[PDB]
Amino acid sequence: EVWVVGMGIVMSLIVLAIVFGNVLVITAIAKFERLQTVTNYFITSLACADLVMGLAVVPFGAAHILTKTWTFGNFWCEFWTSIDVLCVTASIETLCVIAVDRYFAITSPFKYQSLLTKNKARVIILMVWIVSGLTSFLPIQMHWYRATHQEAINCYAEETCCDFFTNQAYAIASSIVSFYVPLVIMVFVYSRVFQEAKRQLQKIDKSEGRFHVHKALKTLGIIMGTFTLCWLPFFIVNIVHVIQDNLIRKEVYILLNWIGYVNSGFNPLIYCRSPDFRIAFQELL
Numbered sequence: 001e002v003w004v005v006g007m008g009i010v011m012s013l014i015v016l017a018i019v020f021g022n023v024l025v026i027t028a029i030a031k032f033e034r035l036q037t038v039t040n041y042f043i044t045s046l047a048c049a050d051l052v053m054g055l056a057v058v059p060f061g062a063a064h065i066l067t068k069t070w071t072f073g074n075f076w077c078e079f080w081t082s083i084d085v086l087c088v089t090a091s092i093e094t095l096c097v098i099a100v101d102r103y104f105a106i107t108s109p110f111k112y113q114s115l116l117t118k119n120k121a122r123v124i125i126l127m128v129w130i131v132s133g134l135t136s137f138l139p140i141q142m143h144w145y146r147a148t149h150q151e152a153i154n155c156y157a158e159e160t161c162c163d164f165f166t167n168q169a170y171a172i173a174s175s176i177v178s179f180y181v182p183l184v185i186m187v188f189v190y191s192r193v194f195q196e197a198k199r200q201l202q203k204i205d206k207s208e209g210r211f212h213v214h215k216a217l218k219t220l221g222i223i224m225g226t227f228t229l230c231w232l233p234f235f236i237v238n239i240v241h242v243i244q245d246n247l248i249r250k251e252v253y254i255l256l257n258w259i260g261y262v263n264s265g266f267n268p269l270i271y272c273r274s275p276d277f278r279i280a281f282q283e284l285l
């Protein structure tokens with residue numbers, strides 16, 4: 001009967017990895033003073049979002065699947081849903097602002113210093129968190145997302161069940177604000193950055209060609225393919241399941257949602273590979 005204990009160990013490992021990586025990153029930035037930089041404030045915000053995710057939404061969901069019941073009250077179910085949506089949207093929007101940060105450095109190197117200072121980064125981060133807060137907590141708490149059909153009403157009435165039902169308008173607006181606009185922004189900025197890098201290598205080869213003396217593709221692939229393959233499949237079915245009711249089963253929805261969660265554990269591997277972080281990690285442990 002491996003099922004009862006087969007998934008528990010995997011869920012516990014995911015929780016442990018998500019907590020450990022982000023705690024280590026936050027401590028490394030806090031304790032050392034060479035790693036405090038304008039670029040590293042966005043990484044701090046993303047790490048905080050991932051830490052809250054892996055501490056709050058995953059342990060309570062794991063019990064929900066394992067025990068098939070919501071022992072807690074009806075209030076805590078709505079609170080948990082709100083936290084889940086908040087963390088997801090905040091993480092994705094922080095990824096978008098990191099991409100725009102990288103774009104502005106290469107595109108306009110002379111005016112980069114005046115464009116971004118310690119004061120403006122704080123305002124940008126606060127605005128990103130406020131926008132994430134309004135879209136998640138505000139509509140869910142006043143019950144503007146509730147469905148109409150009888151199954152949703154029966155689910156809402158019972159105090160031992162916590163399942164997700166939503167309207168068409170809320171689902172479409174949530175997907176648009178959470179995923180699609182950041183996806184387009186990242187696509188555009190990273191394409192321009194790649195063009196600039198290719199031009200730079202061409203310029204180098206035009207001059208120093210006589211002596212003998214890829215990476216851009218590998219880096220852009222690691223940055224973009226992970227995000228797309230982790231979060232794109234979920235939002236398509238999130239859009240579809242409202243329009244066509246019988247097509248998507250609940251198990252597929254939950255599986256895709258949980259594949260989306262694991263993206264929180266892969267962020268330190270992607271955004272914290274510079275030698276300075278490696279030295280800092282070496283000193284800590």
Ligand SMILES: CN[C@@H]1CCc2c(ccc(O)c2O)[C@H]1O
Pocket residue numbers: 081084085088089164171174175178257
């Ligand atoms: C509990 N699962 C939720 C359901 C809907 C949803 C999620 C994440 C981001 C959004 O913008 C959403 O509309 C998922 O995490």
